[PDB]
């Protein structure tokens, strides 16, 4: 009786949703047909008789990414009317998704998400995926958020956005949209956790060994982040969390709620079995500056909670004095107004592996959640170089012709520049 | 240096060009070269506003700012909020604003609260009024204000010729009225009296009323002298084309 | 538009000598509101568009249904007030 | 869904569309009779992007062929894939221009321009969703560049918010055939300016030089030169006829590639080029692509990229590759030659890739550059029309049709403003 629903925007999320909808089905023994051959309720529904439909819905304007999800072997799982597809593309630009081609969308996916609701009953929240730095993506969850925000009101929305690289960029125009949607989504979202590829290119390459990764690698293991942080809800547990039970645990202030997260272990069949895995070696390396999933240095900063989930066959009283010596460390230093700053929890359920993948089985695994006041510099980043281009009112004219007002990108400023000044602010001791 | 001009931004609003006058007392102020900088230098018809401030008279002001329009005239007021400026900036009108500098706020950006006497959007030029101290309060200006206006009138001493007509127009809607209209009696001007004001009403009225029946409650005796002394026309009309053709005859004819 | 950390203050107040002078003439390089002009101004305009609302409306009717719309193209229009709707718009 | 159109004008722009069909038909499995023969099932996915469907099976282009003397197009139906061509869409006149701009843009392309425009406006109203237009012709000759860039007008006058593509040859001062080049060429950018949404350059020199000196093929004919400008415009569509990792639209590049509206006059490239005697000693990798990518004798134009500063830049990828070695490439080769990138506009190179590569290559490359260096061209175009104004040389065959000096003083003086105004970012500075 407990029920949550993803949404997926563009192609990136898109692309996320398929590898993390792989790994939903492989952990609950559904073929991809849909068919098995109590827990599958969280993510699924049952038909009366056979087949599983899972609560998700796909949105894009490009029909390229729908049209190969609707004839690979995924065909028959999803319902047919559920992958919204649009004609055209809003081609990177910002004010096409949010004023111009979305708004003619936007009707149809809130009446499938209230067809999805009204046959849940005891709907936890609603998760979302978005690649930022693009035009449908950023507006089209934009859009969404503040419609969601008021239809529903004071149901959870939790927002894993991937926000672009700090030197590695595909696109040149993606800093002003970026903005745009973070203006969108401080004031409509509960929670945001950063996702950028430079990082997770460091750690595919540094610990998986892998020369030449596609995006297929780094999904796979931002899925295997989602299914560690949603396992307590459909698992037995000596320790459990649900959903709920983080604005109370790890954002203190309302406009606080980006944070950062790490994953640990993360090795290869060929030398995963020659070590023992034990709980305090990957406790240790999930606290490494190195394998932070976003590229950001966590001893700039101070922390201010970690939220970190276990998995496995892991004992209480190990984590305990796991804790211990991380407090005893010296470059791990928490915010003064904060004397315990960990939430813990603990399953039984060992993750699963997916054929043909990169990560080998084991028993024992981490996940950490860790709200820190480092996260500033990638706002300053991309402020700077909002700067740059905004003084010159370069590719302004992209986006005044798409019915945007001059004075949206000032506010947007504004609004990053009290961002910047209220985590300062709160990083200073008493 | 006895005044500054400066290039002033109204929020959401016109480029004025705002001067800074630091003592309104200087004994010969230098008039020619102040509207040489500000390009003043032809002679204006001017219109000048005697009480002006906010009131519910729209389409008179639509009126005048026509009659303005039409004969290329200067209209003068206390640069406070009046409801001729939308009309001022669709006509491109030159609106000159004169008061003291401690008595005017700077309008705030994005203020969802107006001051009464804030500096509004419309005025072209404004005059910022200051004594040596500071102190300056309504009516001191007013003296200032006249000799602008004679100025402006006037244009520029090399053009031979008689100055532009000036029309005063009476609106008290303010009760410091009655200074303006001393000068004005002073310097021989005409003096148009507006329905609308409460004060303006009782002048019209008793205008109208034969002696025995005359009844001054809100005016004060100086102005019962003035009103015999001066040449008083009464407006007992609120249309936009009565003040049009009193302005527009005024300004090209003086009737004494 | 306020700053970060700037309740309010004035966003627009002074610069040097008319400077912007140049500045506005580089960047250089009004809607007529009836409810707000003169009552002759709207009741005679009124009159004119209510003598000519024939000629108006076949000019809008003429014109409403010439541009090529990808959207409209008789393939997807499920419904007739849909075909109505648009009909009833120019471009 | 959002295809586009295909209008010609002209001899050599018929020339250029005689090979570009060939290799889109070659590409789709297409027999010259219109009878698929394929082998792949993407074959036939995207097909109504440039083909259309008539009873019996066969396909048949929608494109639009124009000129003012017959010869030409009684030519190309002879020739190989002639026959695919509808009957219909050949509209001629029985008299020509003779290379004067004014007998083909206010006498006699005047009274032509409305049949054609007939049957453009009945392929542009039936299309599914319009995606824009496509106009292949050349600045050199009189019809050509006067009907054309009228057309263009036209075109742009109805329908306002479509996307306009134009690839021009220019004519070149070191191989000129036409004395009267100067004049049209002038009187021509002026209109181009101010309604084409994108234009793409190509001289005649350049691709001699490219033919000499990186084939090293003894003699190059014309279709040669026709293959590479058609390899080239193929390569710019592939990934809206084709699934990818990143697809990007031509609105999608016009988005990422003009900043301001003006400047939106680019030079492109392919790669790889090699000659057929050292074929086999390369090797295809992508660091190999991309150092003859920004090769300065690999531009499709005399314009040397060195002596200026880039803007923006675009490479759209084809075959199956990882990402995460595109991008490293593409930083490198932007760290390496910081001194040839504009400042002010941090991260100003764009990636796509295609996992569909041309048929017979692994790996290619396209590559569309927005650049300062474009000056030199307009320089030496303006300095060849004024040297040649001055003393009024061939001014009257223009006069005697209704045109006047006014007309060119204007062109020259506008012409003059887009040379200056483009450099004028060159020395911006932040
Ligand atoms: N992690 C990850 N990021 C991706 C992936 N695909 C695209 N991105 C990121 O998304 C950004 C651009 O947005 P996209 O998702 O590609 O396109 P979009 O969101 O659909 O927006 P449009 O361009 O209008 O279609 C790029 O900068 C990429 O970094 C992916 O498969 N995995
Ligand atoms: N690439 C290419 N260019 C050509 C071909 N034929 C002519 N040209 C170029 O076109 C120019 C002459 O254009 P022209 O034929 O007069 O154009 P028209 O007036 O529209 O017919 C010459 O400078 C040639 O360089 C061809 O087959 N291929
Ligand atoms: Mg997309």
């Not at chain 1, 999904?219 to 000596?238: M, Y």
């Not at chain 1, 993360?266 to 995963?272: M, P, Q, T, V």
């Not at chain 4, 099932?41 to 494109?63: C, F, H, K, M, S």
């Given at each position: 009786?407990?029920?949550?629903?993803?949404?997926?925007?563009?192609?990136?999320?898109?692309?996320?949703?398929?590898?993390?909808?792989?790994?939903?089905?492989?952990?609950?023994?559904?073929?991809?047909?849909?068919?098995?051959?109590?827990?599958?309720?969280?993510?699924?529904?049952?038909?009366?008789?056979?087949?599983?439909?899972?609560?998700?819905?796909?949105?894009?304007?490009?029909?390229?990414?729908?049209?190969?999800?609707?004839?690979?072997?995924?065909?028959?799982?999803?319902?047919?009317?559920?992958?919204?597809?649009?004609?055209?593309?809003?081609?990177?630009?910002?004010?096409?998704?949010?004023?111009?081609?979305?708004?003619?969308?936007?009707?149809?996916?809130?009446?499938?998400?209230?067809?999805?609701?009204?046959?849940?009953?005891?709907?936890?929240?609603?998760?979302?995926?978005?690649?930022?730095?693009?035009?449908?993506?950023?507006?089209?969850?934009?859009?969404?958020?503040?419609?969601?925000?008021?239809?529903?009101?004071?149901?959870?929305?939790?927002?894993?956005?991937?926000?672009?690289?700090?030197?590695?960029?595909?696109?040149?125009?993606?800093?002003?949209?970026?903005?745009?949607?973070?203006?969108?989504?401080?004031?409509?979202?509960?929670?945001?956790?950063?996702?950028?590829?430079?990082?997770?290119?460091?750690?595919?390459?540094?610990?998986?060994?892998?020369?030449?990764?596609?995006?297929?690698?780094?999904?796979?293991?931002?899925?295997?982040?989602?299914?560690?942080?949603?396992?307590?809800?459909?698992?037995?547990?000596?320790?459990?969390?649900?959903?709920?039970?983080?604005?109370?645990?790890?954002?203190?202030?309302?406009?606080?709620?980006?944070?950062?997260?790490?994953?640990?272990?993360?090795?290869?069949?060929?030398?995963?079995?020659?070590?023992?895995?034990?709980?305090?070696?990957?406790?240790?390396?999930?606290?490494?500056?190195?394998?932070?999933?976003?590229?950001?240095?966590?001893?700039?900063?101070?922390?201010?909670?970690?939220?970190?989930?276990?998995?496995?066959?892991?004992?209480?009283?190990?984590?305990?004095?796991?804790?211990?010596?991380?407090?005893?460390?010296?470059?791990?230093?928490?915010?003064?107004?904060?004397?315990?700053?960990?939430?813990?929890?603990?399953?039984?359920?060992?993750?699963?592996?997916?054929?043909?993948?990169?990560?080998?089985?084991?028993?024992?695994?981490?996940?950490?959640?860790?709200?820190?006041?480092?996260?500033?510099?990638?706002?300053?980043?991309?402020?700077?170089?909002?700067?740059?281009?905004?003084?010159?009112?370069?590719?302004?004219?992209?986006?005044?012709?798409?019915?945007?007002?001059?004075?949206?990108?000032?506010?947007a400023r504004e609004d990053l520049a009290a961002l910047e000044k209220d985590y300062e602010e709160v990083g200073i001791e008493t | 240096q006895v005044w500054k001009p400066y290039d002033f931004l109204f929020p959401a609003g016109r480029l004025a060009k705002l001067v800074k006058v630091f003592d309104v007392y200087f004994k010969n102020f230098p008039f020619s070269d102040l509207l040489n900088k500000l390009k003043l230098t032809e002679g204006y018809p001017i219109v000048n506003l005697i009480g002006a401030a906010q009131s519910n008279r729209g389409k008179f002001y639509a009126g005048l700012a026509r009659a303005c329009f039409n004969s290329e005239a200067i209209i003068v007021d206390s640069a406070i909020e009046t409801g001729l400026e939308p009309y001022v900036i669709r006509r491109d009108l030159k609106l000159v604003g004169v008061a003291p500098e401690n008595c005017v706020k700077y309008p705030k950006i994005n203020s969802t609260y107006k001051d009464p006497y804030e500096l509004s959007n419309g005025h072209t030029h404004?005059?910022?009024?200051?004594?040596?101290?500071?102190?300056?309060?309504?009516?001191?200006?007013?003296?200032?204000?006249?000799?602008?206006?004679?100025?402006?009138?006037?244009?520029?001493?090399?053009?031979?010729?008689?100055?532009?007509?000036?029309?005063?127009?009476?609106?008290?809607?303010?009760?410091?009225?009655?200074?303006?209209?001393?000068?004005?009696?002073?310097?021989?001007?005409?003096?148009?009296?507006?329905?609308?004001?409460?004060?303006?009403?009782?002048?019209?009225?008793?205008?109208?009323?034969?002696?025995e029946e005359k009844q001054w409650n809100l005016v004060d005796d100086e102005m019962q002298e003035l009103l015999q002394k001066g040449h008083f026309y009464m407006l007992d009309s609120l249309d936009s084309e009565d003040i049009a053709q009193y302005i527009h005859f005024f300004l090209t004819f003086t009737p004494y | 538009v306020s700053n970060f950390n700037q309740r309010d203050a004035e966003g627009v107040l002074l610069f040097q000598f008319g400077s912007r002078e140049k500045q506005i003439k580089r960047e250089n390089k009004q809607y007529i509101d009836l409810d707000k002009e003169e009552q002759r101004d709207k009741d005679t305009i009124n009159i004119l568009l209510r003598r000519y609302n024939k000629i108006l409306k076949n000019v809008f009717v003429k014109y409403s249904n010439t541009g090529f719309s990808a959207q409209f193209s008789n393939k997807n229009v499920n419904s007739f007030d849909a075909i109505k709707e648009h009909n009833s718009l120019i471009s | 869904?959002?295809?586009?159109?295909?209008?010609?004008?002209?001899?050599?722009?018929?020339?250029?569309?005689?090979?570009?069909?060939?290799?889109?038909?070659?590409?789709?499995?297409?027999?010259?009779?219109?009878?698929?023969?394929?082998?792949?099932?993407?074959?036939?996915?995207?097909?109504?992007?440039?083909?259309?469907?008539?009873?019996?099976?066969?396909?048949?282009?929608?494109?639009?062929?124009?000129?003012?003397?017959?010869?030409?197009?009684?030519?190309?139906?002879?020739?190989?894939?002639?026959?695919?061509?509808?009957?219909?869409?050949?509209?001629?006149?029985?008299?020509?221009?003779?290379?004067?701009?004014?007998?083909?843009?206010?006498?006699?392309?005047?009274?032509?321009?409305?049949?054609?425009?007939?049957?453009?406006?009945?392929?542009?109203?039936?299309?599914?969703?319009?995606?824009?237009?496509?106009?292949?012709?050349?600045?050199?000759?009189?019809?050509?560049?006067?009907?054309?860039?009228?057309?263009?007008?036209?075109?742009?006058?109805?329908?306002?918010?479509?996307?306009?593509?134009?690839?021009?040859?220019?004519?070149?001062?070191?191989?000129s055939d036409t004395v009267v080049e100067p004049y049209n060429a002038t009187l021509s950018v002026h209109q181009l300016v101010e309604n084409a949404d994108e234009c793409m350059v190509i001289d005649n020199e350049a691709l001699y030089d490219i033919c000499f000196r990186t084939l090293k093929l003894t003699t190059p004919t014309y279709g040669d030169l026709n293959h590479l400008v058609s390899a080239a415009m193929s390569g710019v569509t592939c990934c809206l006829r084709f699934p990818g990792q990143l697809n990007s639209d031509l609105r999608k590049l016009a988005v990422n590639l003009i900043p301001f509206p003006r400047l939106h006059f680019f030079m492109i490239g392919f790669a790889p080029l090699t000659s057929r005697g050292s074929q086999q000693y390369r090797a295809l990798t992508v660091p190999e692509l991309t150092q003859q990518m920004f090769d300065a004798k690999n531009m499709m134009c005399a314009a040397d990229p060195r002596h200026g500063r880039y803007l923006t830049a675009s490479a759209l990828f084809r075959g199956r590759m990882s990402t995460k070695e595109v991008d490293e490439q593409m930083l490198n080769v932007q760290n390496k030659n910081s001194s040839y990138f504009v400042e002010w506009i941090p991260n100003n190179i764009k990636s796509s890739i295609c996992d569909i590569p041309p048929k017979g290559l692994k790996m290619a490359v396209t590559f569309v550059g927005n650049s300062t260096a474009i000056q030199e061209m307009f320089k030496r175009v303006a300095e060849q029309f004024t040297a040649m104004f001055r003393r009024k040389a061939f001014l009257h065959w223009y006069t005697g049709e209704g045109m006047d000096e006014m007309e060119f003083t204007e062109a020259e003086s506008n012409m003059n403003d887009l040379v200056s105004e483009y450099q004028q970012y060159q020395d911006a500075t932040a």
């Open positions: 009786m407990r029920e949550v629903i993803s949404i997926h925007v563009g192609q990136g999320g898109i692309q996320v949703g398929n590898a993390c909808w792989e790994l939903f089905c492989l952990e609950h023994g559904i073929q991809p047909d849909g068919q098995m051959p109590d827990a599958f309720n969280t993510f699924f529904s049952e038909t009366g008789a056979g087949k599983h439909v899972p609560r998700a819905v796909f949105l894009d304007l490009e029909p390229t990414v729908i049209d190969e999800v609707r004839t690979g072997t995924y065909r028959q799982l999803f319902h047919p009317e559920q992958l919204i597809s649009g004609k055209e593309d809003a081609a990177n630009n910002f004010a096409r998704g949010h004023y111009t081609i979305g708004k003619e969308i936007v009707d149809l996916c809130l009446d499938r998400i209230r067809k999805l609701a009204d046959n849940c009953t005891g709907l936890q929240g609603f998760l979302v995926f978005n690649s930022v730095g693009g035009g449908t993506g950023s507006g089209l969850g934009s859009l969404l958020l503040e419609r969601l925000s008021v239809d529903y009101g004071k149901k959870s929305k939790l927002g894993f956005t991937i926000y672009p690289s700090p030197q590695v960029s595909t696109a040149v125009v993606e800093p002003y949209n970026s903005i745009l949607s973070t203006h969108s989504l401080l004031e409509h979202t509960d929670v945001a956790v950063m996702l950028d590829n430079e990082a997770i290119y460091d750690i595919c390459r540094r610990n998986l060994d892998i020369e030449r990764p596609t995006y297929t690698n780094l999904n796979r293991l931002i899925a295997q982040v989602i299914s560690s942080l949603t396992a307590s809800l459909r698992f037995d547990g000596a320790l459990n969390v649900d959903i709920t039970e983080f604005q109370t645990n790890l954002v203190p202030y309302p406009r606080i709620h980006f944070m950062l997260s790490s994953y640990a272990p993360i090795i290869s069949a060929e030398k995963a079995y020659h070590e023992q895995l034990s709980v305090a070696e990957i406790t240790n390396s999930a606290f490494e500056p190195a394998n932070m999933m976003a590229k950001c240095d966590p001893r700039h900063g101070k922390y201010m909670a970690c939220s970190m989930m276990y998995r496995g066959d892991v004992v209480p009283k190990d984590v305990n004095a796991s804790i211990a010596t991380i407090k005893t460390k010296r470059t791990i230093q928490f915010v003064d107004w904060c004397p315990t700053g960990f939430k813990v929890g603990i399953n039984y359920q060992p993750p699963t592996v997916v054929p043909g993948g990169d990560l080998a089985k084991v028993m024992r695994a981490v996940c950490m959640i860790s709200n820190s006041t480092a996260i500033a510099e990638v706002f300053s980043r991309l402020d700077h170089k909002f700067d740059l281009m905004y003084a010159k009112r370069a590719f302004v004219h992209w986006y005044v012709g798409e019915g945007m007002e001059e004075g949206e990108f000032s506010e | 404004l005059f910022l009024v200051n004594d040596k101290d500071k102190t300056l309060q309504w009516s001191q200006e007013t003296l200032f204000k006249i000799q602008l206006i004679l100025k402006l009138a006037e244009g520029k001493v090399s053009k031979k010729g008689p100055r532009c007509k000036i029309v005063n127009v009476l609106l008290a809607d303010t009760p410091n009225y009655l200074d303006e209209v001393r000068l004005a009696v002073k310097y021989d001007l005409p003096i148009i009296v507006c329905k609308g004001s409460h004060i303006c009403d009782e002048i019209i009225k008793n205008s109208k009323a034969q002696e | - | 869904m959002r295809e586009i159109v295909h209008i010609q004008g002209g001899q050599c722009g018929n020339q250029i569309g005689a090979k570009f069909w060939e290799v889109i038909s070659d590409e789709h499995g297409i027999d010259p009779t219109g009878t698929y023969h394929g082998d792949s099932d993407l074959q036939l996915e995207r097909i109504n992007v440039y083909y259309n469907e008539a009873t019996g099976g066969r396909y048949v282009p929608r494109a639009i062929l124009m000129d003012l003397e017959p010869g030409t197009m009684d030519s190309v139906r002879a020739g190989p894939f002639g026959q695919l061509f509808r009957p219909d869409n050949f509209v001629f006149g029985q008299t020509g221009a003779g290379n004067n701009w004014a007998k083909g843009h206010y006498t006699e392309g005047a009274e032509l321009i409305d049949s054609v425009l007939d049957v453009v406006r009945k392929e542009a109203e039936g299309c599914d969703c319009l995606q824009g237009f496509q106009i292949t012709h050349s600045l050199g000759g009189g019809t050509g560049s006067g009907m054309g860039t009228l057309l263009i007008s036209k075109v742009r006058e109805e329908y306002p918010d479509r996307i306009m593509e134009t690839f021009s040859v220019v004519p070149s001062p070191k191989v």
